[PDB]
Amino acid sequence: EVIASGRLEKCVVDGVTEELDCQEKVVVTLTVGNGQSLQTEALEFSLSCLNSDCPCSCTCACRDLAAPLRVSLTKSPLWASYPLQYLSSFNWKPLEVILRPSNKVCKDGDWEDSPTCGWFSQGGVRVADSQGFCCECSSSQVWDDTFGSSKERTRANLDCDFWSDPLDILIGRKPVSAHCLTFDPQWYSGYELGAASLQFEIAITVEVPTQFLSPPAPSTREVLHLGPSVPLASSASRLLSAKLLGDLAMYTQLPAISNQVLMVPQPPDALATNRSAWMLLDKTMLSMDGLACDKVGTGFSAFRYQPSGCGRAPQACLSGQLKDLWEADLARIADGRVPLYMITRFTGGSDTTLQSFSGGPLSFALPVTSHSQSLVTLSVAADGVRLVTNRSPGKITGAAVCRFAGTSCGGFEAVAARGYIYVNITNTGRLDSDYTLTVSNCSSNVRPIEARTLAVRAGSAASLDPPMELYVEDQAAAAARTCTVSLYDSVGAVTDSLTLSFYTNATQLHHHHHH
Amino acid sequence: EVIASGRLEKCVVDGVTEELDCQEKVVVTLTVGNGQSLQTEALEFSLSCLNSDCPCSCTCACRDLAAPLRVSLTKSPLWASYPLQYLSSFNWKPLEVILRPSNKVCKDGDWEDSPTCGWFSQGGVRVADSQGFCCECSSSQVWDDTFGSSKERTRANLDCDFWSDPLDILIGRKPVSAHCLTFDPQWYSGYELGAASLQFEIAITVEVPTQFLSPPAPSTREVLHLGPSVPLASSASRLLSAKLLGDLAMYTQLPAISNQVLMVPQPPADALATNRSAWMLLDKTMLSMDGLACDKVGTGFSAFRYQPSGCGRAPQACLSGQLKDLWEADLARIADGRVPLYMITRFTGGSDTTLQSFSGGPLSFALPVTSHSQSLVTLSVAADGVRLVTNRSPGKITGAAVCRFAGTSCGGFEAVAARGYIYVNITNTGRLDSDYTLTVSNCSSNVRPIEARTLAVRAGSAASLDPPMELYVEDQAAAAARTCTVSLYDSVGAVTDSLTLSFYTNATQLHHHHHH
Amino acid sequence: EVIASGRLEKCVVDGVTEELDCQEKVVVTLTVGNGQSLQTEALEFSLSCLNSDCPCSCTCACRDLAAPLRVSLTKSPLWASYPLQYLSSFNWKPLEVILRPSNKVCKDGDWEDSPTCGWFSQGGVRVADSQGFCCECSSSQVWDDTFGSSKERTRANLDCDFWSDPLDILIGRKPVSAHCLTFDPQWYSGYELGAASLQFEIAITVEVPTQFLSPPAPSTREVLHLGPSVPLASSASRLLSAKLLGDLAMYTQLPAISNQVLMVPQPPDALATNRSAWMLLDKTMLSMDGLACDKVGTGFSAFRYQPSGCGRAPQACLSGQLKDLWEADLARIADGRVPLYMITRFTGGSDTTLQSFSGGPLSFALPVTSHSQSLVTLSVAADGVRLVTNRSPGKITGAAVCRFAGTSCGGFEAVAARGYIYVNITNTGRLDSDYTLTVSNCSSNVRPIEARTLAVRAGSAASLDPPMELYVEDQAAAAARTCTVSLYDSVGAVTDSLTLSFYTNATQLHHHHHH
Ligand SMILES: *[C@@H]1O[C@H](CO)[C@@H](O[C@@H]2O[C@H](CO)[C@@H](O[C@@H]3O[C@H](CO[C@H]4O[C@H](CO)[C@@H](O)[C@H](O)[C@@H]4O)[C@@H](O)[C@H](O)[C@@H]3O)[C@H](O)[C@H]2NC(C)=O)[C@H](O)[C@H]1NC(C)=O
Ligand SMILES: *[C@@H]1O[C@H](CO)[C@@H](O[C@@H]2O[C@H](CO)[C@@H](O[C@@H]3O[C@H](CO[C@H]4O[C@H](CO)[C@@H](O)[C@H](O)[C@@H]4O)[C@@H](O)[C@H](O)[C@@H]3O)[C@H](O)[C@H]2NC(C)=O)[C@H](O)[C@H]1NC(C)=O
Ligand SMILES: *[C@@H]1O[C@H](CO)[C@@H](O[C@@H]2O[C@H](CO)[C@@H](O[C@@H]3O[C@H](CO)[C@@H](O)[C@H](O)[C@@H]3O)[C@H](O)[C@H]2NC(C)=O)[C@H](O)[C@H]1NC(C)=O
Ligand SMILES: *[C@@H]1O[C@H](CO)[C@@H](O)[C@H](O)[C@H]1NC(C)=O
Ligand SMILES: *[C@@H]1O[C@H](CO)[C@@H](O)[C@H](O)[C@H]1NC(C)=O
Ligand SMILES: *[C@@H]1O[C@H](CO)[C@@H](O)[C@H](O)[C@H]1NC(C)=O
Ligand SMILES: *[C@@H]1O[C@H](CO)[C@@H](O)[C@H](O)[C@H]1NC(C)=O
Ligand SMILES: *[C@@H]1O[C@H](CO)[C@@H](O)[C@H](O)[C@H]1NC(C)=O
Ligand SMILES: *[C@@H]1O[C@H](CO)[C@@H](O)[C@H](O)[C@H]1NC(C)=O
Ligand SMILES: *[C@@H]1O[C@H](CO)[C@@H](O)[C@H](O)[C@H]1NC(C)=O
Ligand SMILES: *[C@@H]1O[C@H](CO)[C@@H](O)[C@H](O)[C@H]1NC(C)=O
Ligand SMILES: *[C@@H]1O[C@H](CO)[C@@H](O)[C@H](O)[C@H]1NC(C)=O
């Protein structure tokens, strides 16, 4: 979209000579969209006196008369990359091993030279509280289990019936239990994310030459590169000078994951490669010092000194681990709901959308789908400008609402879940044209969706990736909620439009029954 | 504000025929403000050869000569809506019931067939640790309470004096206590908020016809609608083609509530106010999702049963920090001129009425944006010649004062623990609907700068800032009269009125422990 | 950068008379950069009929013929200020005092009239659980310490050997311990931060008068002031009318510190003044009610009722305090890593960059380094406009990568740490010109860096402050990673460029050795 165009006299005072020099250039300001990956528009600058701003006619090394300077602009796919900062490692699933010693002895002493669990060591020094804790059957439980049946739980399901082992309970040796903490061989590295940084590269293609026909005689293509890192560039010789000013505000802000911790499997039916097994967790799920129970990174001190530990069930204090959060999210997928810890809760179902990134192995970035119009200013030493835009018709070749990861299509669960709109369009023209995809005039209590733009090659089909997220703002269950999907060509004309119908199932809640 | 205007030759290559077609249109780029709800400006495009871009003179079906094409733009009120995702339910106030059995027996066994508290059940299976815990008076406390007075607390205020019940303590039956967890009948649904999405709709009114006088002869009004969902539209026939490019960056960013949990009262199937008045928005550090933590929203049976030294602690221990507690705590902050920390009205500034003007569904949440969010719109008309017609009407500041949260008292606030709210009354004294800009500047020392606000006021009507401006001070001292200058600008940046706003700040207060 | 310029007929209908009035003004829209603090560009408006829009020739009170109206724009340094909201106070380091009474008595009763620790008081009422807790040596430990050596830890390192004190253990008096909680005399005030607000002031200098030479005959300089608080202004009389529209989106977003708590030392080899001792903590490090252990603000109830408290080490439950987090971050500085709690983790090493702020004593703001181009619209009653920009060459006079606070330069630790790029440039011209500093064409797995702009006075040297943060997206250890640092003058020409080489050391991780 061209915003401003006109002539301007840019005078430059050379700082060494303090000397003035003025030229009248054409200053065009136009935006570049996120989904604008093809050369659909072109800027043509009328060039008088070609070659070396009229000519000396005619070895001779002179100049030619007239030709148009063609300029187009594309933008690489937009990503939101976060910088990583390592913090600490975490175990996939810490496991408690219960030992029932053969000689009915158990030692968890703090200065115990050799406990029945054994000491860990971070080097030559042994780690505190790594020796677990012991459990003995109380006199009250030996009394109950002998005559009747003890109603008090033991962590090792101890049998304290006197008849179960009379020859040793008589001599005071009661049944004992050892509870040691072990680590899964699978470790994870936890990196704290940073501030989001928009990353892209605008490609400015400039070609200078020697009813409906506009034939091109020999041109020489030159490509400029603009971006946040290099927000300006100039063409060969000194004709075109560009400058990236910045983007406009995004209508739907980025997800607030700046203060979360990215879990990456520490390397030593197969697991999927790259970031498929990655996770991104809030700090309320973690214990950095390891002194808290039922958190990622629970340590020895938390497991050894848990209150009434011998009276609790096995594996207590060891919940909420990376393996638990993973298995929990997989359950949410089977129920049409969105994961809460897997990084695919932003992609919408597939990990393939996150491998198109061009960063290093230890990097994280989400594909931006909101509108981010970057403003570029072109200043050419050529008076006369014209915009040439391709208009190709299109057709919506398919639209449907599907749950997370496409486990089932047609609808989702009202407020606990959300839907994902996959839209298939096809360029029916013979040229590469830009398109705008909008969802509007929905039924009641349906959340508005921001439009998306697709640059489709001629005769090719395209699809929204990642798809649009669809919510509903009530908890009822409707059989056919409606929305209108419209396909706009360039310069804002509707080439095709259909009505998208979907169901929402009612929401479900917890309940406790009192007695 | 008009930004760019000029002529441009837009050539369109029809993709089916690969055929070129060029036209010279006027491309105007202008911004639309957040608080711009009235038609104060108008763009007039000189239209030669009316009707069907000169005419064939003269059934005839021909064209007329000349008239101006009038175009205006308004913007709906701006909101920041967050998508909800349900997580779990939470009880308004879990209550501990203390039982003192008549037969002095108490059973909290894990496999106990029938405990003195009873098992809950999530269906047909009974919930673990729902049977509470029992307490017995230790031998040490029976020894103290019999002769002197025991200094050790019991959760049930047990009387373990032997003389208080000798016939049963002698046969070993000591006084016992049962501590069961119960739930308030009022439940709450907790929805995790999502990413903020700016939502609005720009209304482009276009009317084509067919000293100071500019009379309108018959016009036909056509309204276009642009927004984030539909960022472009075209008029009837093919005269005007619009496109919404986006907004500019906001100077004061939105509140970071993306990862918080919205608490909504769960319906049952002196009265409370309707809609979101009873809603709350909490940080995840106030919650226990698994319920295995004490003194958090959603504390479960396992946390209450296995609390360390539970029988030695006071009643209702581990049951603090609940939805009822956080609510009653915020109400106390209101009575002390401070701002709530959990009620969603801590963003509105005092009144819930500002949040019911939203047009979303029953289960939605949105805050009214007050920062400048200037959206850029590009107009391209097939009519060469353009003119901007803006209404300028004078105004007067009819009132300005600093008030605490919810207007419990005006005149000032508490320095750093609290903040003030600036209510400003203005009145359009002209006969036309003009736009205005409201600024607070040239303040005294250590006063935080405030971003300006814009008000579109109907002719002869009075307007007011809603929600009011939030005012802070960057020191902890107590001043009797801090000053700021409130200025009212008409359109095209002229000061019609200005007054000096004076307010006091009380000194901040801090906690203190006296050791012994 | 000038974006749009042209003529526009702005008609104004006076609301009182309903009367029309039209004038044709020049509407220039141009951006103002973040680092643009000098008058490098200038807008010159051709003014016909000077003095009072041709003249009446010739007391006379008439007008002159012709002169140019010079207009320049600068922007103050950009800051992101956060509003503070006080919450509660916190102690620098709560300390546990262990008492061993001479008479072997210990009382921690709830209704105890006078305990061996003593009651605190918030006024006239005494604070609950302020009397600490007592510890007695169990019969099991007296049995072990008498014959052999007890392997169970006591919090007071108690000696329960019967022979160590036989005359009192015989009469039942066992060794006892008192554990009271005390507070460091240094307190801290904790303020919850608010939403970030961009704060700046654009200075519009307008002076109206009355080969390379352009001499100035007497002008009168007038300065306008625009900003978020006052986004518009008009010149003396009614010539120029300005309006600040807003900034463009920032490419690298601000750090998400909105919901954190700022710790400020509560006033009564010396510490540096202002914010040098300040800290900014996540709410997961705090206990507001004080009922949690090993957190900032741990209270009496947490310390008194800690499970197995008498069996734990001294100072247990009292970790993770403001003194601990401070001493921990200082250790990260000595290891080339970035602090996690000190507010200097955003500045990059020096506190001097945070004292240039102009706020009150209780305020907090970070210097914005991302591009924030503000759009300003100028409308002058003078047809004819010209842009005069100074171009002075520059030279990169130094570039190096240094760890946090400059503890050592040359490189950093790959993912646990980050580097900081200090760049020295010098204006070699005789005029004040603007510059653009870019880092591009890096080696593999190097994170992209957004460009920065420097306004340098003539003949003066400038430096990046705060320096650019440099990350790497892999965990390997390389001896010489390369990037290209380029220096652009105004209107986008490369005056100087060098290649910046640096090393990255491999990352380090935790490890537990099992037994
Ligand atoms: C939009 O266009 C897309 C194509 O560009 C459509 O995707 C197609 O979806 C259909 C089902 O709706 C798939 O047909 C199925 O094919 C499988 C076997 O092929 C697949 O096998 C495995 C899965 O077992 C998979 O990993 C492979 O990659 C194959 O894709 C049959 O068993 C099914 O019965 C069914 O016929 C197409 O394969 C798929 N095409 C592509 C290219 O992926 C999409 O449905 C369209 N959406 C809308 C809303 O119109
Ligand atoms: C970019 O230019 C900067 C100057 O504008 C350069 O900073 C200079 O860095 C050198 C070291 O490379 C310093 O020289 C040192 O001086 C100390 C003694 O002076 C200092 O003493 C104390 C520290 O004990 C300090 O607090 C004072 O302020 C003094 O600065 C010697 O003991 C050292 O051996 C060494 O010679 C310069 O003093 C310093 N200049 C300034 C003005 O700070 C910077 O290195 C340049 N960077 C690049 C990449 O080129
Ligand atoms: C700005 O203008 C509004 C009105 O547009 C002012 O609100 C008015 O405030 C007064 C109090 O100062 C209200 O009068 C009171 O009414 C209550 C009954 O609700 C009565 O008990 C009191 O004795 C008193 O009479 C008045 O009703 C209210 N008007 C409206 C429409 O709400 C506001 O005070 C003005 N603020 C400034 C700073 O000028
Ligand atoms: C991801 O895959 C790419 C190629 O598809 C590979 O170069 C890269 O090393 C992989 N990274 C991880 C972390 O698996
Ligand atoms: C929008 O949909 C409603 C049905 O909900 C229909 O009545 C109306 O005509 C539609 N309007 C447009 C412009 O599609
Ligand atoms: C709800 O989901 C089930 C499958 O889980 C589906 O059969 C049903 O049709 C859905 N509800 C409605 C109203 O369609
Ligand atoms: C809020 O009030 C509106 C009408 O004022 C009503 O339509 C809506 O259902 C209410 N929502 C709730 C959650 O009470
Ligand atoms: C701002 O107010 C102060 C009084 O505190 C006054 O001295 C100064 O002149 C005022 N400045 C302007 C520009 O009004
Ligand atoms: C501080 O607040 C009290 C009421 O809490 C009020 O009476 C007093 O006037 C305030 N301080 C000043 C300086 O006005
Ligand atoms: C910081 O220093 C400035 C002067 O450099 C002083 O005016 C201000 O009071 C100081 N603030 C604090 C909190 O030390
Ligand atoms: C980037 O640097 C490499 C040296 O490793 C050089 O070969 C290449 O030409 C450079 N590319 C550009 C565009 O400067
Ligand atoms: C890694 O750091 C050490 C000091 O910690 C330094 O001596 C060494 O040079 C660094 N690595 C490389 C490759 O330079």
Numbering used by the authors:
A (entry chain B), C (entry chain C): 23 to 74, 76, 79 to 83, 89 to 240, 273 to 330, 342 to 588
B (entry chain A): 23 to 74, 76, 79 to 83, 89 to 240, 273 to 331, 342 to 588
What wording appears in the published article?
The single-pass transmembrane protein HAP2/GCS1 is essential for gamete fusion in organisms across eukaryotic kingdoms, and was likely the ancient sexual fusogen used by primitive eukaryotes before the eukaryotic radiation. Recent work on HAP2 from the green alga Chlamydomonas, the flowering plant Arabidopsis, and the ciliate Tetrahymena shows that HAP2 is, in common with fusogens used by certain enveloped viruses to enter host cells, a class II fusion glycoprotein. Class II fusogens are characterized by their mainly β-sheet-containing-domains I, II, and III (referred to here as D1, D2, and D3). As with viral class II proteins, HAP2 functions uni-directionally.
Here, we report a 2.6 Å trimeric, fusion-state crystal structure of Chlamydomonas HAP2 in which the fusion loops are completely resolved. Chlamydomonas HAP2 glycoprotein (ectodomain residues 23 – 582) with a C-terminal His tag was secreted from Drosophila S2 cells, purified by Ni-affinity chromatography and gel filtration, and crystallized. Three monomers in the asymmetric unit form a trimer and pack against one another through D1 and D2 at the 3-fold axis. In further similarity to other class II fusion-state structures, a U-turn between D1 and D3 enables D3 to pack against the outer faces of D1 and D2. D2.2 at the ‘apical’, narrower end of trimers bears three fusion helices, α1, η1, and α2, in fusion loops 1 and 2 between β-strands c and d. Each helix, α1 in loop 1, and η1 and α2 in loop 2, displays a set of two to three hydrophobic residues that project apically. The Arg185 sidechain guanido group docks through six hydrogen bonds to its carbonyl cage formed by backbone and sidechain carbonyl oxygens in the core of subdomain D2.2. In the crystal structure, however, D2.2 splays away from the 3-fold axis so that the 3-helix fusion surfaces of monomers are separated from one another by solvent. Either as a consequence of omission of protease treatment here, differences in the crystal lattice, or higher resolution, we can visualize 50 more residues per monomer. Because of the large hydrophilic surface exposed on the faces of each monomer surrounding the 3-fold axis, deformation of lipids to fit into this large cavity, or the presence of water in the cavity, would limit the depth to which HAP2 trimers could insert in the hydrophobic core of the membrane bilayer during membrane fusion. These apparent barriers raise the possibility that our crystal structure represents an early fusion state of HAP2 that precedes a more mature state in which reorientation could allow the fusion loops in each monomer to approach and close up at the 3-fold axis to form a common fusion surface.
